[model samples]
Target chain A: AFDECACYTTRRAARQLGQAYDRALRPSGLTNTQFSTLAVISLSEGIDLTMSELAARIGVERTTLTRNLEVMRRDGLVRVMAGCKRIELTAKGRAALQKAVPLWRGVQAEVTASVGDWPRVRRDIANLGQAAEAC
Target chain B: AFDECACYTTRRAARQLGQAYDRALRPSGLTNTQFSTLAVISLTMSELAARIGVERTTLTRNLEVMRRDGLVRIELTAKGRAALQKAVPLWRGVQAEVTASVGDWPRVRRDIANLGQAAEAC
Candidate 1:
């Protein structure tokens, strides 16, 4: 019954994919989320992004991003400057991202590779998200 | 550079998809998580977690919220069973809505289930 739910199916995929990436990134000392956080910051390094901007980019709620940023700050992965509005990836954050990217890519490719029908799978997954966004 | 991250992609998809289902299920007073809990309550915590690809800790939290909502009962009371009876059709409604929204859904389902398997061993 629940097997037919797009909500249930995608969420299950999310957890499975999340755990897989988390496991692959273990040696790099970053969970999937931490890597994404730093990756977001690092990718926007030149011009930077505000708290809202970053959260939007990450497709998460501001409060959720805020909590993550707080933890990241404690670990010296990011800095919130000038009334905590602007965020910058620190040198430590940059270093962490550098170490994390390879692990992330390898796992990403590895997971896709394991699927014989990756193109359709990826297309369908993206479509599911797009359809939801339309609602 | 950013697209290389599996964490980012899967999570973004989850957020967007979650919003759609949440909106569709709003009138029924149940979220997809709660419905999944009820749909698979016969399993143990670990088994449920595995079936859903959720962490046991995450499943516990979801169950807690559902329990508080009276959508679930530890002992499977009449109240809980009644809620499930009401919710099942609502679940089907939203599932159909989402399925129609995304065409070629069977392939998506097949791929996702297969991907879930790949992820388990990866």
Candidate 2:
């Protein structure tokens, strides 16, 4: 499947790190992605977000986020309102996030540390962008 | 379904930055995850990694790692004897990852950096 070797390396590292985040976040019942999604919703000022805007901000296909939201709706963590194509975090959703924050911090901190080369990685990633433009 | 807003949100942000990585790595013919995975196996050494004959190392599951290695073993990247994983032992493990990766990894990287925050949410 690989015409090249890059994604393979990245996926491995992501899996490793994701496994840690997954394990640490297990008690909170939130995967890293799930926890982050919740944080974005709770921290926002508006009562709702359009699927397109939300997906764009976070970097996903609008359709994909919509699918994820649909799952959230089914789980009772959120409710899709009747009139608008928007969603609200239920009280239960808010409460669960409250419970998960501490756990998130612990895992996030460890992860950030593990990628201790954050500065370099960030810089490299940034440089790569420039490098591409330069090319 | 998101039990809480977190996955929705994390999925969003991850989707964003992850998209950056995916886009950046795209020409490399790799996803961020795939790049990292390939790096792990490449930098790893049967000699350097198992140093002192008592190497204390990483938590990468033997099964998972071996599975990934097996995938590499195929694709003409390598051969079975090189991996020491029997063809039968790893067939299930290897091809699926390669095939799905061929199919889904682009989607995953795009899935990662999505911000998922809301303007009217709270």
Candidate 3:
């Protein structure tokens, strides 16, 4: 009999906003989480995050993040570099992200429209992300 | 094809949120899930909330929110009966509100405080 679930509410609300993003990216063979990670990799300028730092930054626990990573590693979408405590995206991952972009934009637009504006939706997404961070 | 997540990043996020909320309610004889459920029940207006509200939306899909929060049944307090009537909606009785603000937050605070849990590992 959970009353107000901060976590559940945040997640449920985010999922409501993200459902379209999930659909548009389905053909890219990526979940929204996967797609977000790949996009970050493609755009970032530095070394990948260490596991602990990565976990902290993502607002997910380090342990659970491992399973997600393992899933991608097993699939060859990402790889573990030698002598490193981090993982890197594969070329295929980049390709998938690239392929998903146009569709991702379409769905993103639909969600923004649903919310009435990109700004309002962005705040909703940010607030959810902020909650996860405080976790 | 993403790697480690940040939101997915805090991997330990969900189960970990339990660390703090577990203990204080242990004596009240509720698991974090249960205690969190009841306290919220006591706080919100019973037989409240109209149909097709947020509660109706997240019940199963949100898992912890709709059902587990125990705003209604399972040792369901009188408050809950009215609330569940409301939470359950035109299904007949008083129902629970899925309101993002008042109805939702009211139950959440006390439940966590009751645990003496800060919403994170104690």
Clashes of 1: 0
How would the docking of model 2 be graded? incorrect
The 10 consecutive residues of candidate 2 chain A with the worst lDDT sum are A3-12
Point to the candidate with the largest lDDT: 1
RMSD of every candidate to native, in Å, equals 2.5, 12.9, 11.6
Tell me the deviation in Å of residue B18 in model 2.
Answer: 7.7
Candidate 1 has what TM-score?
0.87
Compared with the true structure, the alpha-carbon lDDT of candidate 1 equals 0.73
Report per-candidate TM-score of chain A alone.
Answer: 0.84, 0.69, 0.73
Error of 2 at A98 (Å): 1.0
- Per-model interface RMSD values are 2.2, 13.5, 12.3
Clashes of each: 0, 68, 34
Per-residue lDDT tens digits for candidate 1, residues B12-116, read 777787777777667767666665677777337888887765679978998887778776675655666776677777667756776785567786777676666
Q: Candidate 3: where are CA atoms >4 Å away?
A: A1-9, A82-84, A124-135, B1-122
TM-score of each: 0.87, 0.48, 0.52
Q: Write the per-residue lDDT of candidate 1 for residues A1-135, one digit (tens) a residue.
A: 567677777778778888888898888788777788778667666344677777767767788788888988889888887643667878888888888888888877777776666656665677677777886
Q: Model-by-model lDDT, in order?
A: 0.73, 0.44, 0.44
Candidate 1 positional error at B71, Å: 3.6
Sorted by DockQ (best first), the order is 1, 3, 2
